[PDB]
Design a protein around this ligand. Structure first.
Ligand SMILES: NC(=O)c1ncn([C@@H]2O[C@H](COP(=O)(O)O)[C@@H](O)[C@H]2O)c1/N=C/N[C@@H]1O[C@H](COP(=O)(O)O)[C@@H](O)[C@H]1O
Length: 245
């Protein structure tokens, strides 16, 4: 499944280089027609990150997210700044298909385990976004990726498997927003080690060949952000690539 992504800062569509808030490129303040064009090209799922909320959970763009979710007729997943059980419930009530959770899943696993019991594993996506160190450890970043948790992707996956973890979004932060290509070896590895998890690849797609390159990894979703904003290819072309590979 190709999953087009938009990232939002104070109403504006942005790209961050490797998630660095000091390295923005701006793409206007009309995300809704963008999403609607993605849906008309065939997108089956859409992904939204509230970057303002990820940086400060008190400043989440809640009215805007509601407007975007209500404005398309395909499932939308939303992340960025979610901290409480009430946060999750409100997003689901507003029509969000899946809520994406990074920071709190690392910091408070007892709490997030209770969310799995309440909402079900189909409603939650864990964002296990990583900076891979020189030893190979896949260290998960938190707080809008501004902090290194010092906890490995695998430790966190094993933490939530017994409560039915099903969906994981895994960004290679070094690739995010760079057009350099996604980390094929990373997804080959993690998908094979956890066949019961539906992984979404994330970060780095630069052209259609980069999508084709993921064909044998086993990922269930392919997130694409910057390349679609820059028009390297269309959603229609991306979908055709993934269907055929
Ligand atoms: N600093 C950051 O950029 C950042 N910080 C947090 N997130 C997301 O916020 C959510 C977690 O927020 P918390 O629960 O920690 O508050 C998750 O969705 C994280 O991935 C961030 N993700 C931003 N953008 C994603 O980066 C990838 C870029 O792809 P590309 O263009 O094709 O190269 C895509 O997955 C984009 O959606």
């Amino acid at each position: 499944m190709i999953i087009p992504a938009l990232n939002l800062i104070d109403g504006t569509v942005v790209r961050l280089h490797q998630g660095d808030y000091a390295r923005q490129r701006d793409y206007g303040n009309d995300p809704l027609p963008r999403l609607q064009d993605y849906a008309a090209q065939g997108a089956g799922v859409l992904h939204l990150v509230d970057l303002t909320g990820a940086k400060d959970p008190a400043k989440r763009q809640i009215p805007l997210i509601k407007t975007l979710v209500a404005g398309v007729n395909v499932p939308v997943q939303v992340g960025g700044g979610v901290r409480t059980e009430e946060d999750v419930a409100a997003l689901l009530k507003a029509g969000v298909a899946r809520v994406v959770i990074g920071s709190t899943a690392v910091k408070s696993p007892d709490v997030v385990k209770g969310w799995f019991e309440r909402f079900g594993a189909q409603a939650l996506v864990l964002a296990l976004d990583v900076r891979i160190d020189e030893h190979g450890t896949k260290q998960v970043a938190v707080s809008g990726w501004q902090e290194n948790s010092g906890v490995s992707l695998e430790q966190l996956v094993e933490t939530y498997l017994p409560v039915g973890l099903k969906h994981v979004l895994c960004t290679d932060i070094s690739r995010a927003g760079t057009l350099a290509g996604s980390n094929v070896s990373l997804y080959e590895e993690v998908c094979a080690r956890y066949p019961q998890i539906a992984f979404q690849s994330s970060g780095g797609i630069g052209d259609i060949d980069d999508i084709a390159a993921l064909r044998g990894t086993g990922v269930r979703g392919v997130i694409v952000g910057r390349a679609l904003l820059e028009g390297k290819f269309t959603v229609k072309e991306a979908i055709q690539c993934w269907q055929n590979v």
